Amino acid sequence: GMASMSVSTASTEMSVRKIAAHMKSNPNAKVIFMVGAGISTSCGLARLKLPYPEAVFDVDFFQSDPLPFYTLAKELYPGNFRPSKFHYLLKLFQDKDVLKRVYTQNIDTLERQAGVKDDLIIEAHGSFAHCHCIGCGKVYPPQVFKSKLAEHPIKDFVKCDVCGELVKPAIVFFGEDLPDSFSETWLNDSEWLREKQQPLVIVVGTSLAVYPFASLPEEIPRKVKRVLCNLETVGDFKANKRPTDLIVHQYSDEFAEQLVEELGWQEDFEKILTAQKEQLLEIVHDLEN
Amino acid sequence: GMASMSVSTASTEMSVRKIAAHMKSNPNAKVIFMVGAGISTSCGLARLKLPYPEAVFDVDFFQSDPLPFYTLAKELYPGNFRPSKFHYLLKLFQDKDVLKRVYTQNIDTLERQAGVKDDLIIEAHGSFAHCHCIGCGKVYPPQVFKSKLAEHPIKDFVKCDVCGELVKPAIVFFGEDLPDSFSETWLNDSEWLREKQQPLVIVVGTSLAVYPFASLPEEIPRKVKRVLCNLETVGDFKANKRPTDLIVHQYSDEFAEQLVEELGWQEDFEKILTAQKEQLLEIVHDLEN
Amino acid sequence: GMASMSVSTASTEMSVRKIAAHMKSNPNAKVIFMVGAGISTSCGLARLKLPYPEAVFDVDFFQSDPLPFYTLAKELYPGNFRPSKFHYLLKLFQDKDVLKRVYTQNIDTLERQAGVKDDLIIEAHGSFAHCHCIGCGKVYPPQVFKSKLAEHPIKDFVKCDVCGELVKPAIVFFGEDLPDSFSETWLNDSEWLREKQQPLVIVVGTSLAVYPFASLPEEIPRKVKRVLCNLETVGDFKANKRPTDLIVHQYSDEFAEQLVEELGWQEDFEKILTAQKEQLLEIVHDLEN
Ligand SMILES: [Cl-]
Ligand SMILES: [Cl-]
Ligand SMILES: [Cl-]
Ligand SMILES: [Zn+2]
Ligand SMILES: [Zn+2]
Ligand SMILES: [Zn+2]
């Protein structure tokens, strides 16, 4: 009940139990996830004078001098690493046909790496899937940019053959708008939520400091129960706490292990694990050393 | 004036003076109190493996295994202790016909122990006054349950002779709704406030972390002056501070002594004192040791 | 863009750059400033038993015993000190016809001292420009009060020859309403903002703990970009952060130097610098020693 006696943060064990409980008494109810750099943390010339630390990922700076981003770009492309237990929890949920969507701020493609269908993945912060012109918005295949990152140090920078403006991989920089699919799908899942109270929105592993993504939790219908799994209460869970909010100060991997145990899917999960600040600011941080 | 220059927290002395001031220039104006475990703190086999700490006070857990709550229940019933100075401040206010209501989350019956009329007491979290069935809601006299807590260790648990479901004392557990009188009376006092700005709502001794009780302060009419006497600014006083909010980082007993002194009721108060997290979580805490 | 990817606090360098950027792409767009004791900090019998620390600046206490305020009043009048670099930044902005208004809680007249036109200055907390009666509101020249502060220790206190009530300098005390010009002008600048999104509201050097001034930031039109330059995120920037808020944890003087550098006005600024809690609580603090 939304007016039944309850506690805000509570102990991890009770919170995880209440979540599983909610799912058990609400089968055929999908879950929407909203995740950040924290679900990939459990998996881990150089720098040459920048005006400010985040300039490499600033559309304005890039527009005037792309040499620094080009210099670091080679190290950014997604490798073929192993998804965390949490990422696999997303796959597990899909198998049980109970995963409505995953909204991610990460550009490591680890959710896709884990087997999550593209239809259920929303890369709010872009991806390397393609390149685009920062001028007209024209799209190009990944090769165009990846190509230049092989030609000696550099002869020149890829440019739009229609407007002349610079071209870069489709990862959203500070100063750019996010892809249409983001706001458009959220609007769709948003009304979906409104239609159904049996759904859940689980926000995990993000300090909710990057906008507009950080506005998603406050827009969750006040009638839909929201969960936060983060080492600290952040964003809207801190500023505008709701009687039904469930906060779990736990690591995403442990959280995944405990939720699976409570749902009684340990076997299906173990099978999957067997057979099969935000990332940009983190990188910016490492640069400054 | 609600637009006169003022300070949020201010010094204890000025805050207490402003409160007395408000009462002196607003006689025939009752006060509503909202209190927690903090007004009884100034007055102070065992445990056997629980899934989570708060399970003993969780309606769900109880529903499947009441043995642990039965084991601790004997130690919970209200003894005949001495009410704190703050509790007596409530009695003092009643005598002066200036106490509209006391909303309490405590189950120690200390406000009633101090002489506060039942009509002015709202035990939002229940009491041992009676027992009820967690199934149909049927009510039974205290004896039914207290009886079983005398029969050897235990032969079986009290059950509803109409639905068969478990019976327990009327103290609200996590997962249960609060008694009708709570929301119903708050609605009444709420409109009462709306009708009158001469009233005051003083919230004392609670971290405002237990819901729905923790929603009372935000629902106080924005036009009614609210006071918080707590060692820390919490809940809505922290999240949505109002220009007229008065915060007093003081202990409830000291606060009572100082307010009485400022009002000039030391004698009536001394006469009364002469002649005559929340509690559940606190207990849960002690269990874990 | 208000929906373009962005960070809340960000690094000082990027924040200052974005502000200058906003101004460069928004010329003919004035700026409104809201400032506190923090822009004058970079420039630096006795006490005789008070009920509470802030009593000297409390209209109620003053009404019953003005002797303490009279005793300290002599030390309060504005001297002819040198305005800080930040104050001169205000003058600089005026010269560039890009300063719409300065709302200040300070009573040191340093903004006027720096050359800011009175038309653009709003002393929300009063000034020594004149005296007034705390009874009828009658105004008197500064001399009336300053006069008594020369007559031996004291023979009596200045009083209103129309209502008999006490007269004092026009600096707003705790318990008094602010001058009409404050709310009236804010209403004017408020609609002005609504009319224009090219303006900016920069809040600098205040913990936003004194009301009603502390209500200005939340009333800034949600469609107008607001900046906070303070060593700590406070007030509405903390409680109700907005996607477009820009926070700069920097000292006001450094902030001024950096903004000027980014705008490219170093010369005009250097020329000006060449040729040419809140203050009341701070004083109250020093009293207690
Ligand atoms: Cl569906
Ligand atoms: Cl009444
Ligand atoms: Cl104008
Ligand atoms: Zn183009
Ligand atoms: Zn029953
Ligand atoms: Zn007068």
JSON list of C-alpha atoms and ligand atoms in Angstrom, two decimals, chain A residues 28 30 100 192 195-196, ligand 1:
[
{"chain": "A", "resi": 28, "resn": "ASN", "atom": "CA", "xyz": [3.56, -9.69, -16.21]},
{"chain": "A", "resi": 30, "resn": "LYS", "atom": "CA", "xyz": [7.94, -5.13, -16.82]},
{"chain": "A", "resi": 100, "resn": "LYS", "atom": "CA", "xyz": [10.62, -3.05, -20.55]},
{"chain": "A", "resi": 192, "resn": "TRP", "atom": "CA", "xyz": [3.13, 3.22, -20.82]},
{"chain": "A", "resi": 195, "resn": "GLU", "atom": "CA", "xyz": [-1.40, 3.33, -18.43]},
{"chain": "A", "resi": 196, "resn": "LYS", "atom": "CA", "xyz": [-0.47, 0.71, -15.82]},
{"chain": "D", "resi": 1, "resn": "CL", "atom": "CL", "xyz": [4.01, -4.44, -22.22]}
]
